[PDB]
Write a protein that binds this DNA or RNA. Structure first.
Ligand SMILES: O=C1NC(=O)c2c1c1c3ccc(O)cc3[nH]c1c1c2c2ccc(O)cc2n1C1O[C@H](CO)[C@@H](O)[C@H](O)[C@H]1O
Length: 565
DNA sequence: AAAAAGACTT
DNA sequence: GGAAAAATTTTT
DNA sequence: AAAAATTTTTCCAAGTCTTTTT
C-alpha cells in the first residue's frame, strides 16, 4: 500500500502521537558458559571462575588481539570493575590483572568465530529464518493508525567501554540491562507489554510529549539510552524535513547575517566582539558550536565556543598569503581539524585581544558559550541554532557544485562521478576526515589491473577496426561496409566500459581520506539529489541505496526536476 | 540564571 | 555513521 | 571448489539543544 505521511496535515506542536503499542524490547542473549576444556589460569595454576567474573573475563579475552588492552586506563578501569564482580574467595587470590592468563579463552573465541564461517547451508538458513521472525514480532510498533518500523529493538549486550580517543572511563564494564532498568512508553488504550517471566519493568509511562518507546540509564556516563523509530517513520521524517526547511529559512537572510557579524568585529563591547568571530568560524570554516563538557568524564575534545588558547596559533605571512590562522585541535569523536586559513584584517587583530594576558590552558572565548551564542541566533531568526549553519553551508554547496560538475553530454556513470565529486566537496568542508583502511588500500593494484586489462581488449578492438578499413581498399561492397559498422560499434562499447572503470577508480583514490556518509544522510537536503536525478534522467536507485531510499521517501515522491534549495 | 536532566541529532 | 563483521559475490 | 574483493547488517558513542530541577 505505502503510506504517504508527507501529504497529511502537519502534527500540532506539543503532541507527538495519540496511540502507541509495542511488544517492548528484546534482551541481549544470555551468557553461554566456557566448556570444561577451556581454562583460565592465574599465577600458572588453574582457576575455575564464577559465572559473574568469568563473564567479564570473556569480555577482556575477546579484545586480547587489540592494542588498547595494554593501556594503563583500560587495564586500571577494567580490573576495578572486575574485582567487584568477583566472589569473596576470588577477591582474595586475584590481586592483579597482569598475573592472569586469558590465552586459552582468547584462542577458543578465535576458534568459534572460525567455526561459524564453516557452518553448513542448512544451519545458516535456520538462524536467518528465526532472526526474521524476531524482526516481525518485536521489530515494528503501532503509532497512530499505521505500522512503523523500530530502530534498535535489541538492547546492547554487556561488554567493555572504549569509546573514542583518550577516554577516562575506557575499560569499564557496561552492566547488563535487566527489565527492572527499563522504562516503557505506550498509550493508555494500548496493550502494555509483558516483561520476561518473573520480572517487572521499572516504570510504565504514557508520555505523548516524547518520541521514544523504551528508555533506560547506562552505567558508564549515566546518560539515557533510547529505542526510537526507524528513519522511514513519520516522527523521524517530519522532523528531518523541518530541519532542511529551516536551512532554507536561513538562506533568504544568510547574507544579511554574514554582513552583520562583519560590522560587529568593529563593535564597542568585548562580548559582542567575541560572539561575532565565533559565528565566522562556524559559518565559513565549519566548526561545531562547542558545548562545555565535564572534565574527567569524557575525552578532551573541543569545538568553537569551547576552543582554548593552545588550540590556535597566529602567523602573519605563511607561504605567500597575509593573516594566517593555524588550527590544531581534536573535534567531535577525536577527529583532528588542521587548517591554515587567510582571514580578514579585523579578525587576526581581534584574536590577539582574546589571547592577551591568558595562559594556554584557558578558554579563548570567555564571556561566551553555546547558550549565549544561541540566544543571539534566536533574535536573528526564529528557530535558528548553531547547527543550521552546517546544514545550510552543506546543502547549498552541494547544489552549487552539481550545477558545475554535470555536463549535459556525459553518459550515466560519468554523471554519478560528478555527484560523488560534489558530495566529496561537502565532506572536506564539514570535516568528515577518515584514516585509510589497514592494508585494504593495496587492492588498488587489483582495481588498476582491471583497467589495464580493458586496455588489452581495446588494443585488439582498435586493431580490428584497422582490418575493416584496410579491407575496404581491396573489394568495396555491402559485405565489407558492414565490417566498418560492426567493428566500430564494438570499439565504442568497450571504450565506454574503460571510461566507467576509470570513473569509478578516481572515486576511490580521492575519497580515501574522507567520508560522504554523514553529510549524505544528515546535512544534504535529499530533494537536491532527487531534482538532480530527475533532471539528468539518472535513476535514484544508483545514488540512494535500500535504506536511504526509505528514509528519504518524502523527497523521492514530492520533488520535481525544478527544486531549488 | 546555572547546574543537572532528558530528548533527539550526527 | 564510521569501523568491524557477517552474508554475498567476483576472482581464482 | 577455495582464496579473495565487494556489499550490507550489527557494533559502539559523542555531540547539539531543549527542558527540568536546584
Ligand atoms: O555517527 C555516529 N557515531 C556513533 O557512534 C553513532 C552514530 C549514529 C548516527 C549518525 C547519523 C544518523 O543519522 C543516525 C545515527 N545513529 C548513530 C548511532 C551511533 C551509535 C553508537 C553507539 C551505540 O550504541 C548506538 C548508536 N547509534 C544509533 O542512533 C540512535 C542512538 O540513540 C538510535 O536510533 C540507535 O542506537 C542507533 O541507530
Amino acid at each position: 500500500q505505502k503510506w504517504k505521511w508527507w501529504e497529511e496535515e502537519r502534527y500540532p506542536e506539543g503532541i507527538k502521537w495519540k496511540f502507541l503499542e509495542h511488544k517492548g524490547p528484546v534482551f541481549a542473549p544470555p551468557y553461554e558458559p566456557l566448556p570444561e576444556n577451556v581454562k583460565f589460569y592465574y599465577d600458572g595454576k588453574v582457576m575455575k571462575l564464577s559465572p559473574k567474573a568469568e563473564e567479564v573475563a570473556t569480555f577482556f579475552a575477546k579484545m586480547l588481539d587489540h592494542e588498547y588492552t595494554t593501556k594503563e586506563i583500560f587495564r586500571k578501569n577494567f580490573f576495578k570493575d572486575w574485582r567487584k564482580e568477583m566472589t569473596n574467595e576470588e577477591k582474595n587470590i586475584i590481586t592483579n590483572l597482569s598475573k592472569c592468563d586469558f590465552t586459552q579463552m582468547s584462542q577458543y573465541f578465535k576458534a568459534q568465530t572460525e567455526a561459524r564461517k564453516q557452518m553448513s547451508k542448512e544451519e545458516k538458513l535456520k538462524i536467518k529464518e528465526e532472526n526474521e521472525k524476531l524482526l516481525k514480532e518485536y521489530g515494528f510498533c503501532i503509532m497512530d493508525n499505521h505500522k512503523e518500523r523500530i530502530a534498535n529493538f535489541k538492547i546492547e549486550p554487556p561488554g567493555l567501554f572504549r569509546g573514542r580517543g583518550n577516554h577516562p572511563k575506557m575499560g569499564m564494564l557496561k552492566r547488563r540491562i535487566m527489565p527492572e532498568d527499563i522504562i516503557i512508553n505506550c498509550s493508555k488504550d494500548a496493550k502494555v507489554p509483558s516483561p520476561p517471566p518473573g520480572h517487572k519493568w521499572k516504570e510504565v509511562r504514557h508520555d505523548n510529549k516524547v518520541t521514544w518507546l523504551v528508555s533506560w540509564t547506562e552505567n558508564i556516563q549515566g546518560s539515557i539510552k533510547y529505542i526510537m523509530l526507524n528513519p522511514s517513520s513519520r516522527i523521524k521524517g517530519e522532523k528531518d524535513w523541518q530541519k532542511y526547511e529551516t536551512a532554507r529559512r536561513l538562506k533568504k537572510c544568510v547574507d544579511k547575517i554574514r554582513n552583520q557579524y562583519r560590522e560587529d568585529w568593529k563593535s564597542k563591547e568585548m562580548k559582542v566582539r567575541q560572539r561575532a568571530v565565533a559565528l565566522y568560524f562556524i559559518d565559513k570554516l565549519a566548526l561545531r558550536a562547542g558545548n562545555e563538557k565535564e572534565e574527567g568524564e569524557t575525552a578532551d575534545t573541543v569545538g568553537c565556543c569551547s576552543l582554548r588558547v593552545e588550540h590556535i596559533n597566529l602567523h602573519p605571512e605563511l607561504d605567500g598569503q597575509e593573516y594566517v590562522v593555524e588550527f590544531d585541535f581534536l573535534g567531535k569523536d577525536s577527529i583532528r581539524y588542521y587548517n591554515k586559513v587567510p582571514v580578514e584584517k579585523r579578525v587576526f587583530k581581534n584574536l590577539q585581544l582574546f589571547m592577551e594576558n591568558k595562559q594556554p590552558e584557558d578558554d579563548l572565548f570567555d564571556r561566551l558559550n553555546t547558550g549565549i551564542l544561541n540566544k543571539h541566533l534566536q533574535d536573528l531568526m526564529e528557530g535558528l541554532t548553531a547547527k543550521v549553519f552546517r546544514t545550510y553551508n552543506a546543502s547549498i554547496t552541494l547544489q552549487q557544485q552539481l550545477k558545475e560538475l554535470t555536463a549535459p553530454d556525459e553518459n550515466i556513470p560519468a554523471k554519478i562521478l560528478s555527484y560523488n565529486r560534489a558530495n566529496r566537496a561537502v565532506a572536506i568542508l564539514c570535516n568528515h576526515q577518515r584514516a585509510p583502511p589497514k592494508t585494504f588500500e593495496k587492492s588498488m593494484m587489483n582495481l588498476q589491473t582491471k583497467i589495464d586489462a580493458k586496455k588489452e581488449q581495446l588494443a585488439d578492438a582498435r586493431r580490428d577496426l584497422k582490418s575493416a578499413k584496410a579491407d575496404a581498399k581491396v573489394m568495396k561492397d555491402a559485405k565489407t561496409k558492414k565490417v566498418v559498422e560492426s567493428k566500430k560499434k564494438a570499439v565504442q562499447r568497450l571504450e565506454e566500459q574503460l571510461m566507467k572503470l576509470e570513473v569509478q577508480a578516481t572515486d576511490r583514490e580521492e575519497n580515501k581520506q574522507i567520508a560522504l556518509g554523514t553529510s549524505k544522510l544528515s546535512y544534504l537536503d535529499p530533494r537536491i539529489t532527487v531534482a538532480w536525478c530527475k533532471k539528468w534522467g539518472v535513476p535514484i536507485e544508483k545514488i540512494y541505496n535500500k535504506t536511504q531510499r526509505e528514509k528519504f521517501a518524502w523527497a523521492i515522491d514530492m520533488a520535481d526536476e525544478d527544486y531549488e534549495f
